[PDB]
Design a protein around this ligand. Sequence first.
Ligand SMILES: Cc1ccncc1NC(=O)[C@@H](C)OC(F)F
Ligand SMILES: Cc1ccncc1NC(=O)[C@@H](C)OC(F)F
Lengths: 304, 304
Amino acid sequence: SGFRKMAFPSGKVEGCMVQVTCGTTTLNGLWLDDVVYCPRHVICTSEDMLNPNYEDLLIRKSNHNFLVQAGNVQLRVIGHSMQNCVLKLKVDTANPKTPKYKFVRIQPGQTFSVLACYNGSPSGVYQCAMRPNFTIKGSFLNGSCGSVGFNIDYDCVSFCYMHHMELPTGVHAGTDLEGNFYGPFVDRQTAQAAGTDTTITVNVLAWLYAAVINGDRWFLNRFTTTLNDFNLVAMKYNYEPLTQDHVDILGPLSAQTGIAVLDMCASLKELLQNGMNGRTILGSALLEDEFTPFDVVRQCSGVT
Amino acid sequence: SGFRKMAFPSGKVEGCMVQVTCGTTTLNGLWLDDVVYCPRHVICTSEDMLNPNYEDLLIRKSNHNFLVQAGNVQLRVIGHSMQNCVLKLKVDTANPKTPKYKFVRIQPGQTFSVLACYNGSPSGVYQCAMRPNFTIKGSFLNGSCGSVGFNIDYDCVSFCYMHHMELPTGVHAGTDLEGNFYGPFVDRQTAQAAGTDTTITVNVLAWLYAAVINGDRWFLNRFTTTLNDFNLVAMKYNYEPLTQDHVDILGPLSAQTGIAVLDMCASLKELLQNGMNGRTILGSALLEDEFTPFDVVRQCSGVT
Ligand SMILES: Cc1ccncc1NC(=O)[C@@H](C)OC(F)F
Ligand SMILES: Cc1ccncc1NC(=O)[C@@H](C)OC(F)F
């Protein structure tokens, strides 16, 4: 009973967080095996960020200029390299707490947990989604860079995000663990406007299924629709177009509840056209889009 | 930038989770030092829950009937005792992962993180509040009992909740770590209706301050009110009465933003009387009450 915005247990990731300092800049690093991964803007001063030439700034840095501290003990840096927008600091000690891990590049609409950190220390964990405009709506203050996003499948941590930037609009941008930014964002203090933040339709439908499973059913109606008809409404409301791949992914939830995907699409269509009328669904007064169909199945079944 | 429903990093608590089995019932235990704490209804079969006599059911159980497994290794039970609604299983090995800890009994309106577990294994972490009717709105399926709620102050984990029951209305009830239920709930499968779920006024005001700090300011108005005037409106909307103690606790947020507590109360009064008018605050279309003023300061400052 009950449905919550749940993050993955963060222990496996907490054991990887380190502090990285270069000159006067301090941010977070991710220590896996004998490598520490961190944003390359650790080599920048606040003034360098306006127009940084990372290759030129890196020439002035040696291994001893990157101070890496894991808790209260210092790690010895024996090598450094820049891969896209991340720095890889080879250290002389493999992290004894390294979990089984993978680096994945997620698609927009996919969810992940963030372990927000400051100075190598974890402050909290929350669940968010990669928006269709490749931004995330996080909670990051100065010093949180290098905090990571991840998913966990049993004992394997799939790292998908590393925090780099706060856009002037208060939204966040970052990279995968190969240092490639999600979206068109760059690690420069310049005008970078995000595109339309459209709603993740397949996730809203997954969340409506979770609501039916947990008892909130008022929004179920006597109607059905087609993909093309639903999509005309979705376009009008800045919702992502629903495809047959999305319908297929909702198959298990449709099977468990006995509510055809297109019937749920018709419930969603009426909610878009008529609003909630002062009512709530799973404690929310708007349509939630940060639960994937996989998240709904996982939570509704008790996967550990 | 940004404000999220953030849970504490769960690592320190993950290291304490064990599985406890008695007969055919399996739930979660909390292993601290050489004691494993778990709900006493681990000794019950589903049929026993209708009218259990815990003292009588416990007489038929010996140390060897409580199977405690931490990961893949079995713990030897050398003693057992019932304290209120929890069982304390003395084991022969102190948990090497025992963090610095305290057992606290929280007040309604206070928030905490829950590490949802099944079979001694963590599934996820979320933040919730002890409701004014002493229930929590969690996400717990069968097998989640013994999952705990906690707060963390630097390196000390303050355990405040242990999950025991799902009320027929889908809300949750449990105990503190001394085994005393929050509210009037009992560990019996019987009619237990919750009282009015009133809104935690001081937390809504704290969250309005967080919204102003993060840029959402549309709801600020040209009005002020008094405690008695605000409280007439609060009564009408099932909001908890605001006291001078609540005003005092909001002092730091009032000082940081320059918005007097009574002016914020007047903004809240207009939001209650006029609604949001299709608008949102911090991504929510309703007034959020599960952030305490301490949570807002912590998140807005970067406490680790
Ligand atoms: C302040 C802040 C708050 C939260 N996240 C990141 C940042 N920091 C940045 O965006 C820096 C790295 O770039 C800036 F130079 F444009
Ligand atoms: C099913 C379930 C789901 C989530 N939490 C707890 C329970 N379980 C109970 O409430 C049991 C312990 O009492 C019942 F007998 F009244």
